Amino acid sequence: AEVRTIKVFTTVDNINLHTQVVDMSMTYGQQFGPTYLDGADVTKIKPHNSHEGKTFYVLPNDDTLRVEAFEYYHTTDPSFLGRYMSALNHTKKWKYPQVNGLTSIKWADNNSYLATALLTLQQIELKFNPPALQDAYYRARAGEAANFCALILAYCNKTVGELGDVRETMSYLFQHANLDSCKRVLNVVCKTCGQQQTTLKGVEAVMYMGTLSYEQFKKGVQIPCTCGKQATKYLVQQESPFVMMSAPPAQYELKHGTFTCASEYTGNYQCGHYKHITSKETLYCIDGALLTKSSEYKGPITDVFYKENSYTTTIK
Numbered sequence: 001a002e003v004r005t006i007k008v009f010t011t012v013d014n015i016n017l018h019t020q021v022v023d024m025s026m027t028y029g030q031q032f033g034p035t036y037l038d039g040a041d042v043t044k045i046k047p048h049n050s051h052e053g054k055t056f057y058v059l060p061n062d063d064t065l066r067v068e069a070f071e072y073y074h075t076t077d078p079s080f081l082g083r084y085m086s087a088l089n090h091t092k093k094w095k096y097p098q099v100n101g102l103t104s105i106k107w108a109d110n111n112s113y114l115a116t117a118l119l120t121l122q123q124i125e126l127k128f129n130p131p132a133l134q135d136a137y138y139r140a141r142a143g144e145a146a147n148f149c150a151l152i153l154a155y156c157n158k159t160v161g162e163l164g165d166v167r168e169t170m171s172y173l174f175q176h177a178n179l180d181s182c183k184r185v186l187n188v189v190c191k192t193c194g195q196q197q198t199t200l201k202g203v204e205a206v207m208y209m210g211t212l213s214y215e216q217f218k219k220g221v222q223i224p225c226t227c228g229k230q231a232t233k234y235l236v237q238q239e240s241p242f243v244m245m246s247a248p249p250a251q252y253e254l255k256h257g258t259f260t261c262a263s264e265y266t267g268n269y270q271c272g273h274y275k276h277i278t279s280k281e282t283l284y285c286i287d288g289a290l291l292t293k294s295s296e297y298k299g300p301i302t303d304v305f306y307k308e309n310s311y312t313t314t315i316k
């Protein structure tokens, strides 16, 4: 027969585009392997007449594409582009209204934890290492958070509709973020074992679970040791742009100006709903696209984010 063709660009990072010309009789998958058009798995679709001139994502099918894929994503998972494109299929259809000067997400596909995670990220000082994450991190702040949410799902190994934790989401996100000007020096005192200090760097430096009160963490908290005496572990040195305090959900009161932002969890284990409290001239309860404000807050808090720059204790 006769061969018809159109001109289309393929890419893995949407920065370096490689030009291709494809037979319109054969499907995309035969010519490139799996192929996507803005999240549409067009692997089994023959090229159309309107497709000419557009840009499609392909898998890293040669080392030039593999290197470009790493330099933008810092991942070598062959599934990453497919998982990212599957997430982008749903996130591009979500709505991202500007609530209280922050880019929130209107509820859909069980994105409650992603919304309060998105709002939290807009208030803490964080540098993402993958250029895909930073670029999309940037574009979320401007109001276009479709790719950022899709990459968050991709990097956290979560899928659309699947339920997840904000505390476990931020942990994954902190792995893929530059936290090296970050150091926590814990010191533990036991009546029998004696005294020993630890130096935590990276994710463990900014995260702790057991109590929401960062002031209480400064006084000291109770932990066991090799014998069974509840020892006192207290913060000594903290150098990080922020700290995340966590604890299983319980009634907790928040005050005007004493914190940065919080995570509200209501309901059963896993089957609950997330809401975001942020500390402003007053307290704001951002629930997806919904917004209510109050001067006091006592409710089911599980994560509290505090601003820090550098801290050294006065406890001898």
Ligand SMILES: Cc1ccc(N)cc1C(=O)N[C@H](C)c1cccc2ccccc12
Residues within 6 Å of the ligand: 163, 164, 165, 166, 247, 248, 249, 265, 267, 268, 269, 270, 271, 272, 302
């Ligand atoms: C939404 C979700 C998805 C996956 C996983 N693994 C957990 C959760 C989740 O609900 N976590 C919350 C915050 C939670 C944490 C710690 C103790 C809790 C006890 C009771 C109820 C909730 C508790």
Ligand SMILES: [Zn+2]
Residues within 6 Å of the ligand: 063, 066, 067
């Ligand atoms: Zn190679």
Ligand SMILES: [Zn+2]
Residues within 6 Å of the ligand: 090, 109, 160
């Ligand atoms: Zn959906």
Ligand SMILES: [Zn+2]
Residues within 6 Å of the ligand: 190, 191, 192, 193, 194, 225, 226, 227, 228, 229, 231
């Ligand atoms: Zn001991």
